Ligand binder design. Structure first.
Ligand code: C8E
Ligand code: C8E
Ligand code: C8E
Ligand code: C8E
Ligand code: C8E
Ligand code: C8E
Ligand code: C8E
Ligand code: C8E
Ligand code: C8E
Ligand code: C8E
Ligand code: C8E
Ligand code: C8E
Ligand code: C8E
Ligand code: C8E
Ligand code: C8E
Ligand code: C8E
Ligand code: C8E
Ligand code: C8E
Lengths: 197, 340, 340, 340, 199, 200
């Protein structure tokens, strides 16, 4: 952790001002006024744009099975399920149940590549080079390639407000630990390694 | 009707045989509905499979066989497949079906389309969103995702069908509807708009690059009583045909009013009364001209759920010198119906 | 086959698939029946609902799908609805059904219409009361209201069909029939008369404001034996077509005779021999000319009530120089039949 | 579905409703498959009666109802009966059926006719022995009279069909096929020859007193895997159409290759890749020219035995300057299918 | 009970009882019961009772009973089209709430809204007659179905219905001859029946 | 004792048939048949040739006044010809048992039905048994259809193939005749026992 000094700084900016004054209020508004069918209807839709990328990426990892599983997700949900708003593939099989995506970031880490320094950015939060920034490769080919740069920042934000709400309970579970920066960096590496391996 | 039900797939093969006759003055050329034999048959299947606790797949097809054609050259006249579509339904999340199906503006016009033979004059077939049309994808959701009870909506897409006649053609379009139903009462409105074919634009009657249809409806449907009313307007959508100049096309505007009252006696008879008016506006070379204007009195006797009979008298109030040529004589129908 | 029977309504969805071939000289142009592939299928339903102890509702529809067309432009050639009607049956009081249904003079002509493929030459479709026709209301009563046993009658009303061809048109008319059957024997007579349309009058062949058809029948039907005979006469009713002058119309008069004898062997074969002659009279520019003239030898083998096969040979006794052009060659048909 | 089975006769009433759409650049006229709505339904019956231990009678009829026509003048465009035939199956000795049924070279061409929508480009309808055709008598035998297991043959007679268009006509003919099937593997070959109609001979494109079609196939059909390949050649049989000069007729020769690979995942998806090329030869004023040339990537999702959905992408590998006019743009079809 | 012209009626009733019946009507009714077959009898009394069904409907509306009024519409509709112009009681065979009942024509509408008979009269060849009911029922003759009956058909309908009635009575035809004053019975029976209908 | 005028000539022609034309010619051909020809093919052909006689058996049963049997053999021909691939498959007989293939009754038996007699019993070389009434009197059926349509190649072909089948089926019972005192007298008594049964 080279930039441990810098990262702790941007984590404070994030933990103690941009979250409780901005992100966490915006997320509270989301939880109260957006009706549930709309909320999971929206994350069904944004996550559909990643399914062709995950299919391509599981092929590049030598798992044609899971790669065609995520094809099926995209195919079934775009065509029958109203352009990704309805999860027919999951209502279909339990083997089509949505799981969290495996993008180029994981293809690098599957084929052995490391990250670099774990950095913490203001307003972004956590960032590594291999996974974030490596997932941008999936921006070079269709569905994710068709998103204008306004559409990307919107998908970032809509997803951001959703995830940020889906943590409003374990809110204090981070606020109640001696070093909440190191729990937040160990939770990042728990999730990001689990995916590649 | 349900003739197969095994391994979660069930198949409903349904039909009817209707002996129909129309009575109108003279040959019937100047009638609301015409004159002579009107007998037809109907066949179809409604299939529905329980894929799992959330998924019900479904498909349906329905044909119209005319009984009033000879066995020679005219044998196929009026024969048509009416509906043909398949789809998927998700556990209180909605439904989706594509094919030839009812247009969305019928979600409102159905309120008044309850007459024994006629009525529902604005729900033209192959006319954008008011009737059965080919190549529609439809999202519908009932009870608003399980939350709001009795609140349905629906949104629909119309793929262009560039056909041989202007009448039956249409461009790309989209429409939708919302209804609320609560204790016998119902309110609904619906709207659609679409592009017109170059064929439709090169028509003498009608002008505009976009056709547009909306309608709204109220109903009371409880305690053997049925009362319903519909208002809607079209811009560039109702197909009209000028009998004098032998031209076709569309009305640039119409305002459409329909009302229906019916009682269901416990001894079997269901009388019906109705008023229907369709006023066209800004019509090429005419201006304001009535298209539909009649009162109706009718009744149906229900022997049981499979056998019935009906008479339907249309008091045609269209004028004798209608500038578009709409027939101004009355028409009365007598029908006997076996269905299954 | 009865495929539904629940809550006092039962539905018979029935059909057949018939592989047919006709053999006759050359192209078959001068044959009784033509030449080539004749395969067809049939589908229909007979429905019947028990409303209560006195009232039975019924309806029936039946179509002919030709198997001998290509999947291209000619696909619909020969396809037609055969029957389409609904009606009510009253206790001993009889029945009344309206729609497209068999004309009443067939109550007599069916006696001899018992051949495996051909025969029944005078029971023309779309020809007043001798075959299937559109827009008939038919009262029928069997066993004379419960009084006389084996005594049936029926009276029929023919709603005018002003069609596009004179051949298929007809005016308003009425007809009837009475049959008595007692211990294998049956006797029957029937008569109908109706107006001819203006179009039928403006045809070169046939003249008269009124068309009429009657026929009489004897039958013996018992102990595996079947013998039956029909005499009838038509005025202005039999469709004739002069092949030389390329005109159609109607024969001003015809006498019609048909005979049939068949035995049903216990090992399955039902051989049949038959004689048919229909001589027309007072034909414009011709005089007297034969329309039908043959003997038949044929047989049917029944595997069971669902599968059969037959050969039907027509020894055509028509002349080489028939003044109307009726074909003079024989025809032999071979069929295999799956029905349900 | 089997909707009747009683007293030694069972009847399967089957159908499907297919919501179909084809996407191709622009109007789709220069496409592999066209553009727009392609929805259709299908109805048929398959019946089979048990006469005794040796004899089984059978019949079958199947219709195609187009869902993509209007209820107006075009209602019947594309409606057709596909199959209509009856026959007997004998003990070990084989089976014999006559009617409208598949030609014998399809006993080989079916190997590669497995795509979700397209493929099977050489199995033309109304085209001697490669597709559905009228007036064929077909003897088939399984396991060589009980002796050699997995060894089938079939011999078929094609009666002349002198129709109105050269495309759908044919003369007298005969053909046959052999298959060997042994543990996932199958080998098949079949050949037929027939006379050409005088109308067919009087066509600009195509010449020869005799039409000829043969095909051979290998398949592996096991372990959720399906691989198959087809080679064949025609002399004077494949219908061709020159879009530039607006003449039709037949290709004097064609060499035909089809390949198919599909896997069936246990969670429901059946991906498909396939290659098809049909090159014509000795074409009047053109010479050697491609008729079909594509790779296909497609897939089918099977919800259960009754509900499915598919996308079928044709990467159309055919030229811009095809001398016959074959469209060069890709086509991708999307379907939702309810069948029963 | 009030009976003003009782003197005239009894003599005019005796004409009907002692001469015009046993010499004329009762032999005719015997011939009817002897020669007309039953399907024929029930076909006509259904057929004649149909021509009153539209009037019985109209008069039931005027009394504020749309229900009963709409029943008789159903009778007419079903029996005319399906029942072969009224010969067959398809409506009666259909529902029990549609069973043929005694007609309610204009007389009952008058008495419903308060009108009286004034004086009971009895006519020769005609029989019992009131102004309100008989002859007051003639109002229905002024409008459809019954306006289509020529006076031959009208006297034919009256006559055929009457001969049928007399044939049905041929069994009680004699229990009335065994009563002290048969004028007062077939006067109280008239008011018994005509009150029941009017109420 | 039966009456055999030509007994001398016949006994000679029988030895030619028994002891030279059979072991050197016919009997090898018959071994070939059962060794290489498959059964579906063999009983497929005996169905096919026995069909060409069915219309003749029908006509002759009418001339003998048994129209029932006469319409049986029609049905045999009709069913087996159309559905049974031109007589290759015995669909009649698989259908009803009253339709089972039986020995033919042709004009020879029709003459003998009306009591005609055979004349002298002869034996011919390469032919085997021949009488005037039955062999050759059966030739009358060659005058009317199906059998009327057979070319003289097809006639001798039907004769030969039927004959080779018969002789092949006898390949087991062979020795039972080679072990009999006077096999000419058995093989002609076997002829009349058979031909009387059909004729009576
Ligand atoms: C055009 C599509 C090409 C991609 C398909 C290629 C074939 C992929 O084959 C993979 C087969 O693996 C199946 C074995 O199953 C292992 C996983 O299943 C375990 C269940 O949880
Ligand atoms: C709720 O209305 C939805 C209408 O869509 C038709 C659904 O198709 C069949 C599914 O029905 C199964 C249970 O309702
Ligand atoms: C056809 C007439 C519509 C009027 C129906 C009102 C009925 C109310 O009565 C209910 C008791
Ligand atoms: C023209 C005259 O005929 C009028 C018949 O009208 C039928 C009555 O209308 C139906 C009543 O429904 C209640
Ligand atoms: C003129 C005589 O023809 C009358 C027949 O018209 C048909 C009307 O019947 C309809 C029965 O529902
Ligand atoms: C073309 C055949 C028509 C023949 C009809 C006459 C049939 C007579 O035979 C009947 C007697 O058979 C009695 C046998 O009982 C069983
Ligand atoms: C079980 C095997 C299937 C039997 C197949 C029979 C196919 C029939 O082949 C007939 C061949 O005729 C084709 C003509 O080819 C040109 C030769 O003649 C040219 C002109 O003389
Ligand atoms: C090139 O083909 C020329 C015609 O040759 C015909 C031979 O056909 C043999 C087919 O039989 C299988
Ligand atoms: C899509 C193209 C289909 C090619 C076939 C793929 C099948 O191979 C998978 C075999 O492995 C089975 C694993 O268990
Ligand atoms: C023989 C003369 C023809 C008239 C027959 C008409 C039918 C009569 O049946 C009607 C009987 O109705 C009785 C009550 O219905 C309940
Ligand atoms: C011509 C229109 C007639 C419709 C009037 C309906 C009103 C009648 O409703 C009466 C209901 O009360 C009786 C219920 O019986 C149970
Ligand atoms: C207007 C439809 C009526 C059809 C019913 C048939 C009328 C026949 O009745 C004759 C009565 O005398
Ligand atoms: C091309 C058809 C081949 C027919 C041969 C079938 C064999 C017939 O077997 C009959 C069995 O009877 C013993
Ligand atoms: C050419 C057709 C002749 C019809 C023949 C009729 C023969 C009927 O005889 C039946 C006798 O059945 C009794 C024995 O079983
Ligand atoms: C030229 C072919 O003629 C065909 C005649 O078909 C009938 C043959 O079967 C008759 C046996 O009953
Ligand atoms: C065109 C030529 C056809 C003429 C004869 C057709 O009628 C025969 C009916 O039998 C149909 C069965 O097919 C015959 C089987 O032939 C195979 C020969 O072993
Ligand atoms: C073609 C018929 C030949 C007849 C053979 C001759 C038979 C003469 O024998 C006399 C009959 O005597 C019977 C003992
Ligand atoms: O070919 C078969 C017909 O038979 C030929 C000669 O047969 C010899 C008969 O006598 C043998 C003992």
């Amino acid at each position: 952790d080279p930039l441990e000094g810098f990262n702790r700084t941007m984590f404070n900016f994030n933990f103690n001002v941009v979250d409780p004054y901005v992100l966490r209020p915006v997320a509270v508004a989301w939880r109260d006024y957006v009706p549930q069918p709309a909320r999971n209807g929206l994350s069904n839709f944004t996550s559909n744009l990643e399914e062709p990328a995950v299919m391509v990426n599981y092929f590049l990892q030598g798992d044609p099975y899971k790669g065609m599983v995520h094809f099926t997700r995209f195919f079934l949900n775009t065509i029958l399920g109203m352009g990704g708003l309805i999860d027919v593939a999951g209502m279909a099989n339990p083997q089509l149940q949505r799981v969290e995506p495996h993008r180029f970031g994981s293809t690098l880490g599957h084929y052995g590549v490391g990250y670099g320094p774990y950095v913490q950015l203001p307003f972004y939060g956590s960032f590594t080079l291999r996974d974030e920034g490596g997932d941008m490769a999936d921006g070079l080919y269709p569905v994710l390639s068709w998103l204008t740069w306004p559409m990307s920042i919107g998908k970032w934000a809509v997803e951001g407000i959703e995830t940020r709400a889906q943590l409003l309970d374990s809110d204090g579970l981070l606020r109640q630990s001696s070093d909440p920066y190191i729990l937040m960096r160990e939770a990042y590496f728990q999730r990001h390694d689990f995916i590649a391996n | 009707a349900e003739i197969y039900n095994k391994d979660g797939n069930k198949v409903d093969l349904y039909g009817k045989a209707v002996g129909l006759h129309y009575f109108s003055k003279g040959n019937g050329e100047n009638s609301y509905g015409g004159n002579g034999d009107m007998t037809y048959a109907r066949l179809g299947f409604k299939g529905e499979t329980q894929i799992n606790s959330d998924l019900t797949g479904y498909g349906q097809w329905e044909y119209n066989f005319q009984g009033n054609n000879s066995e020679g050259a005219d044998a196929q006249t009026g024969n048509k497949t009416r509906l043909a579509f398949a789809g998927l339904k998700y556990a209180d999340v909605g439904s989706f079906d594509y094919g030839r199906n009812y247009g969305v503006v019928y979600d409102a016009l159905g309120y008044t389309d309850m007459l024994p033979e006629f009525g529902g004059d604005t729900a033209y077939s192959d006319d954008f969103f008011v009737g059965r049309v080919g190549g529609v994808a439809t999202y519908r959701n009932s009870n608003f995702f399980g939350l709001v009870d009795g609140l349905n909506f629906a949104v629909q897409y119309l793929g262009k069908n560039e056909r041989d006649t202007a009448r039956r053609s249409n461009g790309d379009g989209v429409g939708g509807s919302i209804s609320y139903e609560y204790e016998g009462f119902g309110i609904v409105g619906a709207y659609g708009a679409a592009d017109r074919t170059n064929l439709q634009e090169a028509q003498p009657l009608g002008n505009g690059k976009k056709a547009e249809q909306w309608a709204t409806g109220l109903k009371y449907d409880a305690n053997n009583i049925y009362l319903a009313a519909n208002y809607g307007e079209t811009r560039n959508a109702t197909p009209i045909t000028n009998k004098f100049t032998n031209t076709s096309g569309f009305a640039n505007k119409t305002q459409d009013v329909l009302l229906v009252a019916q009682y269901q006696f416990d001894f079997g008879l269901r009388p019906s009364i109705a008023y229907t008016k369709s006023k066209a506006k800004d019509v090429e070379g005419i201006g304001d001209v009535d298209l539909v204007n009649y009162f109706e009195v009718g009744a149906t006797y229900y022997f049981n759920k499979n056998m019935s009979t009906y008479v339907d008298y249309i008091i045609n109030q269209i004028d004798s010198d209608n500038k578009l040529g709409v027939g101004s004589d009355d028409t009365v129908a007598v029908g006997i119906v076996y269905q299954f």
